């Protein structure tokens, strides 16, 4: 395709902040990638921000420092950013820019793609039709995740959400083994993980843990330490999504993308906007944050005629534990469902501190069902939730009514509360529970009472499951 020699300029009409203005450029185009070479020999990349006649502006990625007026080369590429996607990238580790960092070789690209991606036709959407298992009993049993659902995970500063993310990574998978393990051996599942805006301790911890779990043969990893250039923050997600797309729809696999710390994404985007001199929007965040998060989240689902899917589990932190902060508000609007973690539960030394009372789901009704699972799921979930809500409000009642006036059934509700928080929720970092184990523990916890109190379960399944 491209065959022309590239240009290079020694023109610098000025510099200001993280930008560098030049001119006398022939037929510039927007979003063109630009290299730079300083007097001391360092090489730095960049992108074109502004274009006006023969004037140009380039935001230098690595940060502007020591750029002379007359001694500075500026080569142009003439193409927008393009990713070298390839199936073989699994088992590797990269930085934000895509340069490998695990002592490995440059990726022998199998195909080149546009970093931005393209919108997917709503006509060719396919509704989800089956669940998955994340390895967490609290999440699978109480709140199903379909193929193609977009469930965020709200957390706050000071909670162990990162440990939960690592646990989800090292145990995510499928439950097709309902019928037979022989037909289950056909596994076509992979995970792509995008650590962004992460401090150094957590980056090392992630790398070590992922390497320890022994399933790195199906994990792609992207790291962007908080040291690296702030603009690389808002380029890491695009690379991750392009890779996930190429794997999903060109290899017919089942990919699970997990994004971390979207608050840092928001902050980096804010800084880019403010450097770009644009007028501020609400709360100092730019107006089109909605559109931007939309174009990031909307790349998933299922495609008619392709055997594959993309599931999204973004994570983010709520400043000041404020549920009406814009980032969680917009994230909730665009996405489907929500999962909480609560300070008090972590403060009860319960791991994972997953607060199911305000945790919802949107596709649970259709993710589960006969065949893809047992026939005894939805009623069990309803009963567990109802029992737990009764138990908690009843503890609130006994707090003042006195334990002496309590009925014996009241003690049964308290027993349910304590056992539910002792066994169902608490699992431990490596106790890989399956869905079937989770439902077994659920039935065991339900066995405390007679079927008469269990008024959310149909009698037909009571005659089968309750007397076990």
């Amino acid at each position: 395709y491209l065959s022309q020699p590239r240009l290079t300029y020694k023109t610098v009409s000025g510099v200001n902040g993280p930008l560098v203005i030049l001119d006398h450029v022939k037929f510039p185009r927007y979003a063109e990638i630009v290299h730079l070479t300083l007097p001391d020999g360092t090489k730095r990349s960049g992108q074109v921000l502004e274009v006006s006649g023969s004037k140009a502006v380039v935001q230098v990625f690595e940060g502007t420092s020591g750029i002379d007026a007359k001694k500075t080369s500026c080569e142009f590429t003439g193409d927008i950013l393009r990713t070298p996607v390839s199936e073989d990238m699994l088992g590797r580790v990269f930085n934000g820019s895509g340069k490998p960092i695990d002592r490995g070789p440059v990726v022998l690209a199998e195909d080149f793609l546009d970093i931005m991606g393209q919108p997917i036709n709503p006509q060719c959407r396919i509704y989800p039709e089956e669940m998955i298992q994340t390895g967490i009993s609290a999440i699978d049993g109480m709140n199903s995740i379909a193929r193609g659902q977009k469930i965020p995970i709200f957390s706050a500063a000071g909670l162990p959400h990162n440990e939960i993310a690592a646990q989800i990574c090292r145990q995510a998978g499928l439950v097709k083994k309902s019928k037979d393990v022989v037909d289950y051996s056909e596994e076509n599942f992979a995970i792509v993980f995008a650590a962004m805006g992460v401090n150094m301790e957590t980056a090392r911890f992630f790398k070590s843990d992922f390497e320890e779990n022994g399933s790195m043969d199906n994990v792609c990893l992207f790291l962007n330490l908080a040291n690296d250039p702030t603009i690389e923050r808002i380029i890491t997600p695009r690379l991750a999504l392009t890779t996930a797309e190429f794997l999903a729809y060109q290899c017919e696999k089942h990919v699970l993308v997990i994004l971390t710390d979207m608050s840092s994404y928001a902050e980096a985007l804010r800084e880019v906007s403010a450097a770009r001199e644009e007028v501020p929007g609400r709360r100092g965040f730019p107006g089109y944050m909605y559109t931007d998060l939309a174009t990031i989240y909307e790349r998933a689902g299922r495609v008619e005629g392709r055997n594959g899917s993309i599931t999204q589990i973004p994570i983010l932190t709520m400043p000041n534990d404020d549920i009406t902060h814009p980032i969680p508000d917009l994230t909730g609007y665009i996405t489907e469902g929500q999962i909480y973690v609560d300070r008090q539960l972590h403060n009860r030394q319960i791991y994972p501190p997953i607060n199911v009372l305000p945790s919802l789901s949107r596709l649970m009704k259709s993710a589960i069902g006969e065949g893809m699972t047992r026939k005894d799921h939805a009623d069990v979930s309803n009963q567990l939730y109802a029992c737990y809500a009764i138990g908690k409000d009843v503890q609130a009642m006994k707090a003042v009514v006195g334990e002496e006036a309590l009925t014996s059934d009241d003690l049964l509700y308290l027993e349910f509360l304590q056992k539910f928080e002792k066994n169902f929720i608490t699992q431990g970092p490596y106790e890989n529970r399956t869905v079937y184990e989770t439902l077994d523990i659920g039935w065991q916890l339900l066995r405390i009472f007679p079927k008469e109190m269990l008024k959310r379960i149909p009698q037909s399944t009571l005659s089968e499951f309750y007397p076990r």
């Binding site: 919108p119 709503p122 060719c124 959407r125 929007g281 609400r282 730019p286 107006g287 089109y288 909307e298």
Partner: protein, 206 residues
């Protein structure tokens, strides 16, 4: 025919509303009766039902066409109403017949361009008016109205406009009025002398 979007077709005259809209369910049909050629609003949130009203009106109503407008929706609603086409079928001529032959859909997703999201509701109004002009009884479900509100905020985000309230541009009220105005019964302009009307159902999503 090609017709500009941001203007209203002429008619002979606007007429009073003097007929009640037919709804399949006696509840909200005998208590809080909607009117043919009326204007209404319904809350909309997950778990209770919003497109349930769409199904009920699309099958069991005297309307001659349904024009649905979507903003920030999934392929679910499209595929499910596609399933309603051979499922929700009516014995109008003693024969079950698909809703696909009657209704039309215009929808978009969030990740499509902003201006498209804004132009969606106007093209929907135009289509509703055009089918009304042919002597029919249109019903237009302009759902996800709060999404259109966010779309207007987005448009104003790149115009250096003064934020009237929470970023909402000043002319939000003008656009609201100009939208809900285009409705009501009319004797149509032309030799045949027919009569029809348009209803609107704006799904508020607080």
């Amino acid at each position: 025919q090609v017709w500009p979007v941001r203007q209203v077709r002429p008619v002979t005259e606007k007429l009073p509303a003097n007929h009640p809209l037919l709804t399949g369910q006696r509840v909200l049909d005998a208590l809080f009766p909607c009117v043919q050629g009326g204007t209404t609003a319904i809350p909309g949130a997950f778990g209770c039902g919003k497109t349930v009203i769409s199904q009920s009106l699309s099958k069991y109503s005297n309307s001659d066409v349904i024009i649905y407008v979507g903003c920030g929706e999934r392929g679910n609603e499209m595929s499910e109403v596609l399933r309603d086409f051979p499922e929700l079928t009516m014995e109008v001529d003693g024969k079950v017949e698909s809703i696909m032959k009657r209704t039309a859909l215009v929808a978009n997703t969030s990740n499509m361009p902003v201006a498209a999201r804004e132009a969606s509701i106007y093209t929907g109004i135009t289509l509703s008016e055009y089918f009304r002009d042919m002597g029919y009884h249109v019903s237009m479900m302009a759902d996800s109205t709060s999404r259109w509100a966010e779309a207007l905020r987005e448009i104003s985000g790149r115009l250096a406009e003064m934020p009237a309230d929470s970023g909402y541009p000043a002319y939000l009220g003008a656009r609201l009025a100009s939208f809900y105005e285009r409705a009501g019964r009319v004797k149509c302009l032309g030799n045949p002398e027919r009569e029809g009307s348009v209803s609107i159902v704006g799904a508020v999503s607080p």
